[PDB]
Design a binder for this molecule. Structure first.
Ligand SMILES: O=c1n(Cc2ccc(O)cc2)nc2c(Cc3ccccc3)nc(-c3ccc(O)cc3)cn12
Length: 295
């Protein structure tokens, strides 16, 4: 599936002072509804092979985060977590959702999704998460050691690596897919970022937001601490952790969430971008989880 084929399936809606593109399998319907949230440096395209296993049984939506995919670029180039959340929250209000929804989320889309869920607890039917932002990072001994990588990307070298050389798209993304993407698939990930410069700013600001304590991002830290406390104590919120083997953050997430209530786990093969290696197994697990929500 080329990018052109995927985005031809998608719609666009005005959101605040911009616009967001999104997949909607059944517009305007209040049936069982699932929202899929990508992270960095992907788009709704990440879910293209997962959704076909879920949409037979549920209305499926998948937005492109602001500045990403086919969503609008912001002239102020401000793509912090709270900026993304402002646009994504307005998107939620613009697409005629039912009262309760299931959130499926990945990477920074789980940061946004966990936070949205924490702030709209009455709307949460269930949460499916994978390679997700489940807690703050204190010591690097619990997590994959990317301390120096984060120091580097927060330095002025990050502007060169990302805005000029597209580091997250051309180096990081293929490094955490087990197979090699076809040229058409790789071009779909490149398309939102083909212009060097501030078009690529979302893929640089996202890693600079990583919730390292004492890392200068106290608003992100408070947000993650808050939803972590809720997720750790929410016995009424069904959760599905999709564990990637070998994964990247998956081993740490398994430990961090081991005492989360009302959580089931399924393991699939993959690295960080597990959707590109096990889309069928992920989609089937989501479909089965939706069935369990009726209990
Ligand atoms: O902000 C982030 N998240 C968000 C996040 C945080 C905690 C969590 O539990 C889940 C998600 N994730 C990353 C990753 C992970 C990854 C991406 C792609 C390939 C290989 C690894 N890698 C980097 C990075 C890696 C090198 C580098 O030079 C600069 C940055 C940043 N990340």
């Amino acid at each position: 599936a080329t990018g052109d084929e995927w985005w031809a399936k998608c719609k666009q809606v005005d959101v605040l002072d911009s616009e967001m593109s999104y997949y909607d399998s059944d517009p305007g319907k209040h049936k069982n509804t699932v929202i899929f949230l990508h992270g960095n440096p992907t788009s709704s395209y990440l879910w293209r092979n997962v959704i076909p296993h879920v949409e037979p049984l549920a209305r499926c939506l998948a937005p492109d985060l602001i500045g990403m995919g086919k969503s609008g670029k912001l002239p102020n180039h401000s793509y912090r977590f709270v900026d993304h959340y402002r646009y994504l929250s307005a998107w939620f209000d613009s697409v005629n959702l039912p009262e309760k929804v299931t959130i499926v989320c990945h990477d920074w889309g789980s940061g946004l999704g966990f936070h949205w869920c924490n702030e709209h607890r009455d709307r949460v039917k269930g949460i499916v998460h994978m390679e997700s932002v489940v807690d703050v990072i204190e010591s690097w001994d619990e997590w994959p050691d990317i301390e120096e990588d984060i120091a580097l990307i927060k330095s002025e070298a990050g502007e060169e690596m990302v805005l000029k050389k597209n580091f997250f798209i051309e180096r990081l993304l293929p490094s955490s897919i087990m197979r090699k993407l076809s040229e058409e698939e790789m071009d779909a990930y490149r398309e939102p970022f083909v212009e060097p410069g501030e078009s690529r700013r979302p893929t640089l600001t996202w890693p600079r937001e990583i919730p390292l304590v004492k890392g200068g991002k106290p608003d992100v830290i408070e947000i993650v601490k808050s939803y972590n406390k809720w997720l750790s104590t929410s016995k009424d919120i069904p959760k599905l952790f999709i564990n990637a083997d070998p994964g990247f953050f998956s081993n740490a997430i398994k430990k961090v969430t081991k005492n989360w209530p009302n959580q089931k786990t399924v393991t699939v093969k993959g690295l960080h971008f597990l959707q590109e290696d096990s889309p069928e197994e992920i989609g089937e697990a989501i479909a089965d989880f939706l069935n369990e929500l009726t209990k």
